[PDB]
Design brief:
The protein has one domain: Collagenase (Catalytic Domain) (3-Layer(aba) Sandwich). Helices cover about 25% and strands about 20% of the residues. The protein binds calcium ion (3 copies), platinum (II) ion and zinc ion (2 copies). It comes from Homo sapiens.
Length: about 170
């Protein structure tokens, strides 16, 4: 696994998130579920905990955007870059942006929202890309036969625990 340079990490264990807007691709329920599950994957193996905010500024602001959307890194239309997220810190740091020129799915027929969110949240928490191909943090989007037995790899667990420790 890899962390970001200087090992930027959150310096509190309780983090807030907010879902700023919703893709037309999916029911709102399936967006909330995918995000909740992606946060849970990391919560399970650390002492971090998350709560949703419906107004004000949360640590991890989550949104769907296309092309120019408010930062210096425009999205690129269908395929290729699916989403991007910033390392831990104030303001835009921590935030995760999802390219709505992708077709977001609950399953693996388009681009799976849970899997890409779990990966991007890994960045929001301080993990950079892994060299390990089995790792959630490996760069490459991997459709893969069966999301149902999804497991974070030991590599992902090792990286995130190197930052925040194991559950208490
Ligand atoms: Ca933020
Ligand atoms: Ca794209
Ligand atoms: Ca879309
Ligand atoms: Pt915000
Ligand atoms: Zn962005
Ligand atoms: Zn990545």
């Amino acid at each position: 696994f890899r962390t970001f340079p200087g090992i930027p990490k959150w310096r509190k264990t309780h983090l807030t998130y907010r879902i700023v807007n919703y893709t037309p691709d999916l029911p709102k329920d399936a967006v909330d579920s995918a995000v909740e599950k992606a946060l849970k994957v990391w919560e399970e193996v650390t002492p971090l905990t998350f709560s949703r905010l419906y107004e004000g500024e949360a640590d991890i602001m989550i949104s769907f955007a296309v092309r120019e959307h408010g930062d210096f890194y425009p999205f690129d239309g269908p395929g290729n870059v699916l989403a991007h997220a910033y390392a831990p810190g104030p303001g835009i740091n921590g935030d995760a942006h999802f390219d709505d020129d992708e077709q977001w799915t609950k399953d693996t027929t388009g681009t799976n929202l849970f899997l890409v969110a779990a990966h991007e949240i890994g960045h929001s928490l301080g993990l950079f890309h892994s060299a390990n191909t089995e790792a959630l943090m490996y760069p490459l989007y991997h459709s893969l036969t069966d999301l149902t037995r999804f497991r974070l790899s030991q590599d992902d667990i090792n990286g995130i625990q190197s930052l925040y420790g194991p559950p208490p």
